Ligand binder design. Structure first.
Ligand SMILES: [Cl-]
Length: 145
């Protein structure tokens, strides 16, 4: 379940980052399409209960795109996966949900990092990218296989 891309967008609809682990045009387009779902009058972003809801919003060019809105903060998370690799099993949706939770925690830990909290946006973005690399980047060994 290696993501194709991870996008974070803030409560005012300004992108925080579009991360691609390792085209940049493709995922910018997919991210923009996703923002249209967040703005739609016909999308329900929440469950009956308070647990944040994972949504499968669309699939395009072999990328299955999932998204979530954090009700209380307005944070928007968008993650794409390789569609042909997906089983659709319950355990896989639970794994995808875990990835959303982990991405959110990482974000909160970076933006409220004891040093970065008082620093510029560029430094937060750089830190987010390295934290996401530790999770998502394919190793030399994985690439050769
Ligand atoms: Cl949040």
């Amino acid at each position: 379940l290696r993501p194709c891309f991870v996008s974070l967008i803030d409560e005012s609809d300004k992108p925080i980052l579009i991360y691609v682990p390792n085209d940049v045009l493709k995922y910018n387009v997919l991210s923009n399409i996703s923002l249209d779902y967040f703005e739609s009058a016909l999308v329900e972003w929440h469950s009956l209960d308070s647990k944040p809801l994972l949504k499968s919003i669309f699939q395009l060019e072999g990328v299955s795109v999932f998204a979530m809105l954090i009700k209380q903060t307005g944070l928007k998370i968008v993650i794409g996966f390789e569609q042909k690799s997906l089983s659709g099993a319950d355990d896989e949706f639970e794994a995808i949900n875990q990835i959303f939770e982990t991405v959110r925690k990482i974000y909160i830990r970076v933006k409220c990092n004891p040093l970065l909290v008082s620093g510029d946006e560029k430094s937060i973005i750089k830190s987010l990218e390295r934290k996401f690399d530790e999770l998502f980047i394919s190793t030399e060994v994985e690439l050769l296989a």
